[PDB]
Amino acid sequence: VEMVDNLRGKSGQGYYVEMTVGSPPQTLNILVDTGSSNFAVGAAPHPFLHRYYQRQLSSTYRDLRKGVYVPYTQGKWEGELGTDLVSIPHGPNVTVRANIAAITESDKFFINGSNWEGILGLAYAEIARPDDSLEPFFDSLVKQTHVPNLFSLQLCGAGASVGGSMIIGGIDHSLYTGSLWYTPIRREWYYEVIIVRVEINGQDLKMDCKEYNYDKSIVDSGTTNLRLPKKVFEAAVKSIKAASSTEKFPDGFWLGEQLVCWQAGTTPWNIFPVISLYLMGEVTNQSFRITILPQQYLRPVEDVATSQDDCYKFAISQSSTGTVMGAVIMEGFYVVFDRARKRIGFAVSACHVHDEFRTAAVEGPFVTLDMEDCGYN
Numbered sequence: 043v044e045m046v047d048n049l050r051g052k053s054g055q056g057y058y059v060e061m062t063v064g065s066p067p068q069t070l071n072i073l074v075d076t077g078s079s080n081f082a083v084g085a086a087p088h089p090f091l092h093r094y095y096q097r098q099l100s101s102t103y104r105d106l107r108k109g110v111y112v113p114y115t116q117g118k119w120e121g122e123l124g125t126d127l128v129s130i131p132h133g134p135n136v137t138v139r140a141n142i143a144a145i146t147e148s149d150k151f152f153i154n155g156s157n158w159e160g161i162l163g164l165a166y167a168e169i170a171r172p173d174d175s176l177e178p179f180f181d182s183l184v185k186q187t188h189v190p191n192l193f194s195l196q197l198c199g200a201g202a203s204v205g206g207s208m209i210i211g212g213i214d215h216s217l218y219t220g221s222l223w224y225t226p227i228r229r230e231w232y233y234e235v236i237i238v239r240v241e242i243n244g245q246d247l248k249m250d251c252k253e254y255n256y257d258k259s260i261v262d263s264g265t266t267n268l269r270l271p272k273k274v275f276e277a278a279v280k281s282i283k284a285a286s287s288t289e290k291f292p293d294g295f296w297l298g299e300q301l302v303c304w305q306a307g308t309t310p311w312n313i314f315p316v317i318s319l320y321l322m323g324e325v326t327n328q329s330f331r332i333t334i335l336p337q338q339y340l341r342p343v344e345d346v347a348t349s350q351d352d353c354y355k356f357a358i359s360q361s362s363t364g365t366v367m368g369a370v371i372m373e374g375f376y377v378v379f380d381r382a383r384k385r386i387g388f389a390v391s392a393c394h395v396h397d398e399f400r401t402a403a404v405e406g407p408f409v410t411l412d413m414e415d416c417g418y419n
């Protein structure tokens with residue numbers, strides 16, 4: 043399909059897809075964000091924008107006469123709502139009319155050299171700003187075209203520059219191997235899921251499973267790290283420390299605020315454990331596990347200045363807002379957002395993570411006869 047390899051990015055800075063807005067079409071790169079539900083594009087000059095949406099140049103622009111403000115984990119923006127024609131040159135061969143927030147002010151949102159100038163929130167209307175009557179893009183796309191109500195993401199961030207695919211309307215079987223395991227979307231707002239068990243080096247963290255979903259867990263392509271509620275993050279760090287205790291790192295490293303560096307080519311991958319996240323299955327008390335390697339959770343930081351070394355930031359961090367399965371954990375899986383059947387599917391992706399000793403995996407089933415719902419509330 044002409045859709046394969048339509049994502050690009052820089053590591054830690056999100057993955058983006060080419061879109062056009064307006065008529066005649068204005069080309070913009072747009073961040074793919076399953077962690078939010080607003081379509082917003084820079085629409086005035088900013089030191090970090092290479093280009094921006096010029097509403098005056100679009101004869102199909104319609105102004106909704108309504109402001110909007112979106113704060114995310116750290117960045118935020120404000121702008122003006124309207125609608126316009128939108129296309130995805132390397133996606134489905136359609137043009138739809140969609141709501142678009144024209145960002146006119148922002149703080150800590152745009153990133154210097156990221157190459158994107160806007161954001162596609164792919165989650166549900168329940169969390170759109172200003173409220174749930176602002177129809178999200180994907181809903182408009184499905185309503186206006188015959189595109190099936192499903193999209194999949196293969197995020198590779200493999201060899202700063204990263205790639206992948208966003209396949210809309212379909213499952214591309216050349217993008218994964220083995221089977222697809224499905225977890226139910228628990229509620230349609232974020233892509234909310236349920237983690238039932240966490241292991242490090244195969245050792246269970248032995249917590250009540252509701253702690254892992256305090257107070258929701260989501261799948262979030264717009265967030266880099268695996269973020270964990272404090273109690274789970276502390277338990278996990280203790281475990282990973284213990285597994286890797288042949289070397290000691292500063293506390294700043296574990297807090298995500300300092301790099302760790304090894305002379306180029308010598309990163310000791312084998313001293314770090316794998317992490318397994320077990321997700322609720324489609325049948326009662328069954329689960330499957332996705333297993334992640336330290337090549338995924340030690341994120342490389344490209345910097346020519348430090349390049350006699352390879353240097354890494356620890357990409358597991360504390361959350362006061364629930365577990366966030368960010369790009370770290372999506373990378374090397376093919377993740378299918380099957381909105382039509384209210385589930386998300388995971389399979390090992392054609393760009394999987396891989397070492398001569400260990401491989402990321404998606405595998406099941408696992409059973410737990412213990413009858414506790416792991417949903418927080």
Ligand SMILES: CC(=O)N[C@@H](Cc1ccccc1)[C@H](O)CN[C@H]1CC(C)(C)Cc2nn(CC(C)(C)C)cc21
Nearest residue numbers: 075077078113114115116117151169262264265363
């Ligand atoms: C790290 C981050 O904030 N990512 C957001 C996307 C983004 C991409 C580039 C620059 C800045 C922001 C992504 O949407 C975050 N997803 C969730 C992460 C949460 C649940 C911990 C907090 C939150 N707030 N929002 C905003 C809203 C409440 C309006 C849905 C989205 C989210």
